[PDB]
Amino acid sequence: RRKWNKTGHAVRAIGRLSSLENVYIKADKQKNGIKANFKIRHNIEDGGVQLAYHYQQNTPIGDGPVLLPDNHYLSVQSKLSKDPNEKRDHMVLLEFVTAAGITLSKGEELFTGVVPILVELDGDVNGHKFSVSGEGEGDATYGKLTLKFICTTGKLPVPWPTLVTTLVQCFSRYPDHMKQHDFFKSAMPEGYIQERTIFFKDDGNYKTRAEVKFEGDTLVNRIELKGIDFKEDGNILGHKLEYNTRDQLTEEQIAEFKEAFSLFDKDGDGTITTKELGTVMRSLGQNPTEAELQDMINEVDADGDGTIDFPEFLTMMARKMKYTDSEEEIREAFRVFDKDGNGYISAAELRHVMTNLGEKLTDEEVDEMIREADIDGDGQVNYEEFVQMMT
Ligand SMILES: [Ca+2]
Ligand SMILES: [Ca+2]
Ligand SMILES: [Ca+2]
Ligand SMILES: [Ca+2]
Secondary structure (H helix, E strand, C coil): CCCHHHHHHHHHHHHHHCCCCCEEEEEEHHHCEEEEEEEEEEEECCCCEEEEEEEEEEEECCCCCCCCCCCEEEEEEEEEECCCCCCCCEEEEEEEEEEECCCCCHHHHHHCCEEEEEEEEEEEECCEEEEEEEEEEEECCCCEEEEEEEECCCCCCCCHHHHCCCCCHHHCECCHHHHHHCHHHHCCCCCEEEEEEEEECCCCEEEEEEEEEEECCEEEEEEEEEEECCCCCCCCCCCCECCCCCCCCCCHHHHHHHHHHHHHCCCCCCEECHHHHHHHHHHCCCCCCHHHHHHHHHCCCCCCCCCEEHHHHHHHHHHHHHCCCCHHHHHHHHHHHCCCCCCEECHHHHHHHHHHCCCCCCCCHHHHHHHHHCCCCCCCEEHHHHHHHCC
16 A cells, blocks of 8 residues: 555655765865864754754864874764753763765874763853853764763753754774774874854854863863854744654664665665666666766765665664755655656656556556545645655
């Protein structure tokens, strides 16, 4: 019956492979350091997403030699939670961060074990001031951080999720073939200055400056933050963002991702190659080049082997499900079906898409699908009915 799921997930998979969701790092020779750019998604409580576009620069505090890396990225897995015995406004954070993006230093020695962390933030967003203190520990062997933060000035005037990126990338796990690309540990113990501008789409921006360095045996991140131009009714000052992660995979969701994986993995060997990916995308009426295919795989290719293996696919789909897609992204998916751009998916346009995915399909399982999605009753699927089908 409902294989709006199978094809829904394949659309989600291709959308993910066509997007840039990681933390992209590049050398900045003029500053003897690095710069980064990335996009963060903050789910909006009532539906929708609030995008936050980050630009970042890091410069070493010391004069010692540092590693200036080839282009690569960090991939972050975050989980936010609450301490049931904590009365104060607070956030508990657990993060695993790994570098990738490149295919197959003295300061790094400071990170072979568990290192205590302290974080201190003083903030001012549209004149609303606040401070946060955090403490915990990092275990870079696994890319792992555990921290608890408290708003020490009372009530935090912005949502906790918007501060996560600001509140120690020296704890990232760099794989063995990428150790010469880890600028962050190479700058230790004297540390680095990290600066960002963060643009919240349709809203204001944060500007941050931080000093990250060892003070005795503790890695300390001391930050100032200034936010301007926020809407007093927007998602940030109006506190409309979801807090809790949404990290639960109902095992049959995993079975669903497996079914989607098999659309790509047509030889059944448990990994997707460029040839397989290209075969799927041509069937959907696209024509990416070999280089575009390699770049798409590289975006999720944790091990650098040039293919997406089943666990790498599960990891990418888990993250795609955790965060809401923007209207622009959903419209792009909708355009895949709405081939004539009239704003309506007809049973003919729908036939075409699935029948190209290899869905041996006839003529009433098709219409049973239209029926499922067809809420107003006009015999077609419009954008708003489509949005729901992608949920
Ligand atoms: Ca395969
Ligand atoms: Ca791989
Ligand atoms: Ca149409
Ligand atoms: Ca309709």
